Amino acid sequence: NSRFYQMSPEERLASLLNEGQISADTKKEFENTALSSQIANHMIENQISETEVPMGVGLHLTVDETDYLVPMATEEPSVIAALSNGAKIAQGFKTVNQQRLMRGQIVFYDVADPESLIDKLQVREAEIFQQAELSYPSIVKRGGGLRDLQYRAFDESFVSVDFLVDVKDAMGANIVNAMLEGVAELFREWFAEQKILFSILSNYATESVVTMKTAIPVSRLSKGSNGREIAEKIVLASRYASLDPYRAVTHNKGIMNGIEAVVLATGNDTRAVSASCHAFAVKEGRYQGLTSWTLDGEQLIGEISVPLALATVGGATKVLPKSQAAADLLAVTDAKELSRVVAAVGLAQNLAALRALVSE
Amino acid sequence: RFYQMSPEERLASLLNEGQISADTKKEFENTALSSQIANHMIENQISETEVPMGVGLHLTVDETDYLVPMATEEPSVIAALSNGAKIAQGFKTVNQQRLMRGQIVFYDVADPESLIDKLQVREAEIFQQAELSYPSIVKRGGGLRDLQYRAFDESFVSVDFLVDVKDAMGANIVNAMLEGVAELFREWFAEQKILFSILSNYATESVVTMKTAIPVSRLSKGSNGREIAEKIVLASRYASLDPYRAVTHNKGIMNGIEAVVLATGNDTRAVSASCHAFAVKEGRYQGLTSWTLDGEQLIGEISVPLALATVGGATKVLPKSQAAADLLAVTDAKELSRVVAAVGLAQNLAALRALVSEGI
Ligand SMILES: [Ca+2]
Ligand SMILES: [Ca+2]
Ligand SMILES: [Ca+2]
Ligand SMILES: [Ca+2]
Ligand SMILES: [Ca+2]
């Protein structure tokens, strides 16, 4: 409690055993680790062991005519089998649209004249962009950096300056934070009368949304001759999810079984993706499903749209050897392609869940 | 054939086919979870993901001290939880419920309110069938407790099941009853059609409310502890106005909650989906905590649906889950949910205190 944060992992475990907080078999199991103790102990604080999540391979996924082998880390049975089944039925997925910009905000408070403050800033945008480069030049040399500023006001007392930043293949926490912390020091020289509450990245990556679709002949749905009937019930089930939040949450949870499994296997931040995806499910003031299914002629059409600010470098994507091994199997080129594969996984998982759900 | 292969044949096939390098194969083979367990929990298993697990410190809930196992790949999370709990000193339970939710959904219903009327006069037979489908839970003092009915779109009827599943998450119990009762509905109403009968992950009857009261002097090592308290109340209030902050505000909460959920072998997707959906109040995605200033004491409160488990799923089959359970030493799932919700509030306190102290 006092020296635990300075203790070595071996001293921590011995301390817990000696104080009776763990048994001898518990200590032996905590010591049964495959991630290097020097890596683990430097990644987090008070480190003592690791959690092991089985990792399997999702099969038959094809996105934009390209085959993939999807690494999926999950503790839940049938998740990988369902992804492989839905992907085989869909045959292929196609990209509809995609953007990739990370969001940040500098928030003012006790603003007497909100509309006038944003007008002061809108004319000096060229100098805000220049201060952004100075606060983080590396990303600008890599070909990214601030791409757009936006302005919003709330409760007649808050003013949010939004930053849309190209963070390239990283998630962008350090880029955006440092960039906005420097641009905030400039905001304070310009307007000493105004006050800043905080300057931080936003995980609601509405400018990293990917939209994927699939078009399935109803014949492919069932090996029998009931495919059209199964398609109609899939459309109804998907429609019902956007009517009843108690189904929407389960509907989207099923999607995240696949999405989070790839996110985890590749060393990405699972809380960030879950937060942004579930928040994005809130449309028209209501929590709805993240996918849509419609019947057009003899073809079942599915579509998904999710904010996926994923990373192929930084964070835990490289420091953890298993992240790199998973990336070798997946063989994506950049983060944009990762988001496309992950979105297609979500839609494939949704197809398998719905088909199994309504086939009675 | 990949599905039928052993884990070793799979890795050999991936290398021989040119999909992974020899270095990657060797890293996939560096595993600590027994191959027999991993290969039986999931499909197409090849390896595992290792997430560093540490110990959150200084957490006190209802005058009981805990050592919190936390599995995360993000630095500073475990340290921030320990610090937030240290400042908090203690956490008190406000209210708690623990019932799991299921639903049988009819479609193409000519008169939803008329079908509901016919159902409400057969509840004794439904309850009787629910027990016959899964008698074990009834003997251990649980089982179906309530039935509710909702109509949607003038064509759907949802029969809602509220079930006491004791220390399990409850998928097998709930789905067993729903299947049995659904077959009864098909005999009773041959003209009606059932779309699906499945567990719902939106556990609104498993919500836990936790609170804390901190003298403002504890927020700062200096003398502006009441200032930092005022700015924490502003940052929290702002989350209830701007969704781009509410997602980040709640993401920070889940850094703690998901870390414990993962360490204890619980379903991370289920908790994430239910918590983020529960954040939608008044048609707006808002924060899951509230912070207010009452004199010289900062008051924090959290309210989250936590249908967590101490048995079933992966809470025991994964040896690290049992080890984590030993460290935390919780008697039942209800207690687990109280501890995890307190972890969420402490993590939020540490994040908000740091967010505003930077702006000063
Ligand atoms: Ca602009
Ligand atoms: Ca490869
Ligand atoms: Ca590529
Ligand atoms: Ca009635
Ligand atoms: Ca113990």
Residue numbers in the entry:
A (entry chain A): 11 to 370
B (entry chain B): 13 to 372
What does the paper say about this structure?
In this pursuit, we report the crystal structure of the target, HMG-CoA reductase in the apo form (Ref-apo), and in complex with the ligands HMG-CoA, mevalonate and the cofactor NADP+ (Ref-ternary), from the pathogenic bacteria E. faecalis. The crystal structures of the apo and the ligand bound enzymes were solved to 2.25 Å and 2.27 Å respectively. The resulting structures follow the overall architecture of the previously published bacterial homologs. Although the asymmetric unit of both the crystal forms (Ref-apo and Ref-ternary) consists of a tetramer arranged as dimer of dimers (AB and CD), the dimer-dimer interface is not conserved. In the apoenzyme structure, the dimer–dimer contact is primarily mediated by a calcium ion donated by calcium acetate in the crystallization condition. Since the dimer-dimer interface is quite small and not conserved across different forms, it is likely a consequence of crystal packing and has no biological relevance. Though otherwise a classic Class II HMGR, its entire N-terminal domain (residues 1-65) undergoes a complete domain swap around the hinge region (residues 42-45) and interacts with the main domain of its dimer partner and in doing so resembles the Class I homologs. All the three efHMGR structures reported here suggest that Gln-57, Ser-59 (in the ENQIS loop) and Glu-60 (residue X) make several interactions, which stabilizes this crossover. In the apoenzyme, Glu-370, the last residue of the hinge is partially disordered.
In this study, we report the crystal structures of HMGR from Enterococcus faecalis (efHMGR) in the apo and liganded forms, highlighting several unique features of this enzyme. HMG-CoA reductase (HMGR) catalyzes the four-electron reduction of (S)-HMG-CoA to (R)-mevalonate, which is the rate-limiting step of the mevalonate pathway. Briefly, efHMGR is an obligate, intertwined dimer with the two active sites composed from components from each of the monomers. For example, Asn-184 (A) means that the residue Asn-184 originates from chain/monomer A. Each monomer consists of three domains: a large domain (residues 1-108 and 212-370) that binds HMG-CoA in an extended conformation, a small domain (residues 109-211), comprised of a non-classical Rossmann nucleotide-binding domain that interacts with NADP+/NADPH, and finally a C-terminal flap domain (residues 371-423) that comprises the last 53 residues of the monomer.
